[PDB]
Design a protein around this ligand. Structure first.
Ligand SMILES: O=C1C=C2C[C@]3(O)COc4c(ccc(O)c4O)C3=C2C=C1O
Ligand SMILES: [Cl-]
Length: 313
């Protein structure tokens, strides 16, 4: 399997780009930054300070190299410095301050324009990083930072983000349960930037249908079952057949007969305004079992759904 876009990007670049094992950060004095408040992560002297956890050294390079690569990115959060504590020789990331407004409080008040705006802003981010050979693997509304007064956005926490090298197999052990795409739930390693487009999409469902999460699996197997109830099982099975995927025996007695529903099955009085058939066209093109069948980040910014947002640019 391969990416429809940006697939060579890293290959055409100096090894130094994407070989993070070879990265050597300069760690600075965290005494430049004092605890003000806690979010883990803290606010400080403004900034936000991330204390890297009991994590292997290799995992840390990957997140610094990637943040430097994406420095100067549209709607991508930015790194002011990487530091350590004098007494505590533990590594630390320090980011620009965005004045957050927790998505659970801010989603319920969104207008059918707010949604496309903030989704457009997300796609600006995802496409930019997809164009640098990096894939996020952790797009949830938690990692989507918004300032509704400022109407700014930042995609955050690149703790999990990996460089894309074609035909490379990746850990299927990433992302949050609700925003995991089918590739992760059926143990398929040869995934790419499409994953984030499932993530994003999943969030689209939530924003216009106000069912948050949209796919609320109660375990990791159920998370695929929950998806088969919308998208249908036959279309699922064909997807597995195509990529010659071994289906774990536990899925045997928990899928069965399921039908492609109508994305309109999810409209009701409370969400009526927020749905437009342009939302329901993009959305379909975004939530497809087959990672390759899915919209790219670019093709998405082109969907009609955003014609109202491009107009006021
Ligand atoms: O891994 C993380 C995790 C967070 C959690 C979180 O604290 C959310 O809230 C934030 C923020 C950063 C700046 C900011 O201004 C803000 O409000 C966050 C992060 C950045 C990261 O890289
Ligand atoms: Cl990983």
């Amino acid at each position: 399997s391969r990416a429809r876009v940006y697939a060579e990007v890293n290959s055409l670049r100096s090894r130094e780009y994407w070989d993070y094992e070879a990265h050597v950060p300069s760690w600075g004095n965290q005494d430049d930054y004092q605890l003000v408040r806690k979010l883990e992560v803290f606010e400080a002297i403004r900034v936000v300070v991330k204390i890297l956890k009991p994590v292997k050294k290799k995992k840390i390079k990957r997140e610094v190299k990637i943040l430097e690569n994406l420095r100067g990115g549209t709607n991508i959060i930015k790194l002011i410095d990487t530091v350590k504590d004098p007494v505590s020789k533990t590594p630390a990331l320090v980011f620009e301050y965005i004045n957050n407004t927790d998505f659970k409080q801010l989603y319920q008040i969104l207008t059918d324009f707010d949604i496309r705006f903030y989704m457009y802003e997300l796609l600006k981010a995802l496409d930019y990083c997809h164009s640098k050979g990096i894939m996020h693997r952790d797009v949830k509304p938690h990692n989507v930072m918004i300032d509704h007064q400022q109407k700014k956005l930042r995609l955050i926490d690149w703790g999990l983000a990996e460089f894309y090298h074609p035909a490379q197999e990746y850990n299927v052990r990433v992302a949050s349960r609700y925003f995991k795409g089918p590739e992760l739930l059926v143990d398929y390693q040869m995934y790419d930037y499409s994953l984030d487009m499932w993530s994003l999409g999943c969030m689209l469902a939530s924003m216009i249908f106000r069912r948050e999460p949209f796919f609320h699996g109660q375990d990791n197997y159920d998370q695929l079952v929950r998806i088969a109830k919308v998208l249908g099982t036959e279309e699922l099975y064909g997807y597995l057949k195509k990529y010659h995927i071994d289906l774990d025996p536990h899925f045997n007695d928990i899928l069965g007969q399921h039908s492609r529903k109508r994305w309109e099955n999810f409209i009701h009085s409370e969400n009526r305004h927020l749905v437009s058939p342009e939302a329901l066209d993009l959305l379909d093109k975004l939530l497809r079992y087959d990672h390759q069948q899915r919209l790219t980040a670019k093709e998405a910014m082109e969907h009609p759904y955003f014609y109202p947002v491009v107009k006021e640019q």
